[PDB]
Design a protein around this ligand. Structure first.
Ligand SMILES: Nc1ccc2c(NCCc3ccccc3)nc(-c3ccccc3)nc2c1
Ligand SMILES: Nc1ccc2c(NCCc3ccccc3)nc(-c3ccccc3)nc2c1
Length: 336
């Protein structure tokens, strides 16, 4: 049962979509693709339809498209963005050019509430959901790597989704230092930064560049111990650190003053410089700060995610075809 498509131009771009999606309203664009709000006549839900910009321009782009399609197809959890549909107007591989992704429409992102400073209880729920999302994603051996308020969608219900304001502000220091072997807890660092911003109303580490980013972080967290330097493989990294003016750790209680002690303690456990000691998503969920939300029965892990393709050097048409297969094999999620 192949659907019937109709065309239309919105802001310099042709959209060919299945009749099922109606009233396409442009709501944004970037170099990755553009998005319209739509009414899905099949489910009666408001959706976002994304049209990938230039999906198969180069090997880099084609391998990006396939990766985006693969991640979205895998995500099946209430606190992570998922895929209601994916389609193409093409009737065969040979004419396959365009990729459209469909997803629930979301009310606003986390800035559209940040810019205002939330009550403690809202902070609990918001950060709860992010961690609950993170546990899932991390369980699948996937790292977000770019968590920040603009990548978090929030309803008027305060229901939060992790989606696919400078990035650098929320980057774990070991990414700033260019470490190749960072773990999942780079996301926990970002959660820490986002959490601190919801409590105080202010960006914790609003650095002008990477050097400055490091200066501000170290001002709160202190210069590394014996034990941390003991574990840096990189000679220049190691000497930069020693090079710098030894900052002592701040007492977080003296920084986020007025904030909930249980909040200050989770921040302590999230914003540790040494990512080996940093609290994990699973562990953070069981922290008492989320006493009123935590439920180990209702914090599911994910199916394993096959990442073997990342190591594959293939041709554009090959990525193109693999993508084509992922388009075809999509099974829509079971309805409301
Ligand atoms: N970091 C972001 C920021 C904004 C985005 C955006 N914006 C449209 C409004 C919307 C916001 C939140 C949820 C749905 C819609 N749409 C999409 C998207 C759409 C369809 C398929 C895959 C991805 N991703 C976004 C990722
Ligand atoms: N077990 C670990 C644990 C943490 C690590 C870490 N994280 C802190 C980075 C940092 C510390 C102090 C000030 C700014 C940033 N960085 C590095 C590292 C960095 C660069 C090149 C090679 C390796 N290795 C780590 C090995």
């Amino acid at each position: 049962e192949r659907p019937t498509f109709y065309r239309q131009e919105l802001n310099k771009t042709i959209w060919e979509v299945p009749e099922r999606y109606q009233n396409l309203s442009p709501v944004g664009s970037g170099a990755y693709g553009s998005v319209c709000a739509a009414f899905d006549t099949k489910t009666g839900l408001r959706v976002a339809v994304k049209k990938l910009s230039r999906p198969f321009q180069s090997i880099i782009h084609a391998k990006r498209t396939y990766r985006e399609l693969r991640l979205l197809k895998h995500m099946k959890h209430e606190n992570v963005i998922g895929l209601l549909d994916v389609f193409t107007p093409a009737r065969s591989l040979e004419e396959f050019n365009d990729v459209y992704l469909v997803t629930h429409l979301m009310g606003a992102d986390l800035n559209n509430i940040v810019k205002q400073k939330l009550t403690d209880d809202h902070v609990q729920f918001l950060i709860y959901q992010i961690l609950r999302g993170l546990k899932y994603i991390h369980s699948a051996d996937i790292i977000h790597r770019d968590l920040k308020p603009s990548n978090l969608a929030v309803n008027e219900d305060c229901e939060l989704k992790i989606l696919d304001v400078a990035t650098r502000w929320y980057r774990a220091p070991e990414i700033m230092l260019n470490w190749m072997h960072y773990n999942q807890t780079v996301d926990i660092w970002s959660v820490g930064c986002i959490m601190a911003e919801l409590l105080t109303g202010r960006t914790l580490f609003p650095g002008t560049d990477h050097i400055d980013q490091l200066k501000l972080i170290l001002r709160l967290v202190g210069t590394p111990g014996a034990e941390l330097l003991k574990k840096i493989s990189s000679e220049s990294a190691r000497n930069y650190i020693q090079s710098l003016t030894q900052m002592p750790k701040m007492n977080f209680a003296n920084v986020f003053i007025g904030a909930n002690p249980l909040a200050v303690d989770l921040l302590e456990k999230m914003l540790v410089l040494d990512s080996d000691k940093r609290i994990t998503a699973a562990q953070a969920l069981a922290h008492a700060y989320f006493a009123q939300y935590h439920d180990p029965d209702d914090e599911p892990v994910a199916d394993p995610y096959d990442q073997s393709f990342e190591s594959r050097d293939l041709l554009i048409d090959e990525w193109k075809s693999l993508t084509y297969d992922e388009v075809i094999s999509f099974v829509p999620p079971p309805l409301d």
